[PDB]
Amino acid sequence: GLAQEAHNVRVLGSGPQTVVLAHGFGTDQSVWKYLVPHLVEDYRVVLFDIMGAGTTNPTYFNFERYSSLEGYAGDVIAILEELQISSCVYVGHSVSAMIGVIASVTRPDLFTKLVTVAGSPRYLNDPDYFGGFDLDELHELFEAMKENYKAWCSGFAPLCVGADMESLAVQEFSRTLFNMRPDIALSILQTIFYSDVRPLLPHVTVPCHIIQSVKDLAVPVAVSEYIHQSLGGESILEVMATEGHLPQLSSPDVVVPVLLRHIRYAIAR
Ligand SMILES: [Mg+2]
Ligand SMILES: [Mg+2]
Ligand code: NA
């Protein structure tokens, strides 16, 4: 299939229950490597890479399509229809959280449940909302990406994963970051940091399970609280006693059980 080839779609497990695992910026579907073995016995598991990941063809990259998160939401829908999947649980890491939120407002029929890991509808600050970042901070971040991409990746990965340089996850993430073509990495990260999905949250109807590390460089806990307060369907908040923006990769011993519970169980009342 077209989307299956372009997004490295892999379908594992078995059964009528389907779980889609969608990774965030700088990594790929390997971010789920410790969760997948605990799902395949009970679920059909759909893995894919978002366009622009270092595992995808950079000559392909459609800069206009991916200048807005709507392009990534369209990709999710196209993958499910190409796979003829009419219903799934969608687990979205970082940017893939809001991508699933957007896809669920366009096509609520495709999702029985959203599970977000370190999602945020807005990273910039305004007088009534603290996203965590201001404009000149972002400017200097983007200039570092342009000036020395390898040095940027090497400094960014430990801060993002929230661990020392020699952490396994830091080293994995350093490598997947540096496999992105620098102009594509910059374009995607600008699309992410300048997004605003806040107006869409009240229009969500799919129940959402909102997960993050208590200490996440990219997501203040107050943002997760804001998501819970703004969503138009049922939702539950579970802040984890972990540090890091890729907690399913760096702290799987405790984060995999959290994800399993929220994939498996419905919100009470
Ligand atoms: Mg991201
Ligand atoms: Mg206001
Ligand atoms: Na639904």
Author numbering: 2 to 270
From the paper:
ShHTL1 of the conserved clade is thought to be the ancestral ShHTL paralog. Only ShHTL1, in the conserved clade, was capable of binding KAR1 (dissociation constant (KD): 77 ± 12 μM; means ± standard deviation (SD), n = 3) with an affinity comparable to that of ShHTL3 of the intermediate clade (KD: 78 ± 3 μM). In contrast, ShHTL1 and ShHTL3 were KAR1 binding proteins without hydrolytic activity toward rac-GR24. In contrast, ShHTL1 and ShHTL3 showed no hydrolytic activity toward rac-GR24, while ShHTL1 had weak 5DS hydrolytic activity, which was so weak that 5DS-dependent germination was not observed in transgenic lines. The ligand-binding pocket of ShHTL1 (321 Å3) was composed of the largest number of bulky residues, resulting in a smaller pocket than AtHTL (411 Å3). Due to major bulky residues and the arrangement of the helix αD1, the pocket sizes of ShHTL1 and ShHTL3 were restricted so that there was only enough space to accommodate KAR. The structural alignment revealed that GR245DS might cause steric hindrance with L142, L/F190, and F194 of the KAR-binding proteins ShHTL1, ShHTL3, and AtHTL. Therefore, it is suggested that ShHTL1 interacts with ShMAX2 or AtMAX2 nonspecifically, while the interactions between AtHTL and ShMAX2 or AtMAX2 were induced in the presence of rac-GR24. Although the KD value for KAR binding of ShHTL1 (77 μM) was higher than the physiological concentration (1 μM), this result might be because the fraction of active protein in the sample was lower than 100%, resulting in lower estimated affinity than real affinity. Rather than the KAR receptor, ShHTL1 is likely to be the receptor for KL, an endogenous signaling molecule that shares structural similarity with KAR, in particular the butenolide ring.
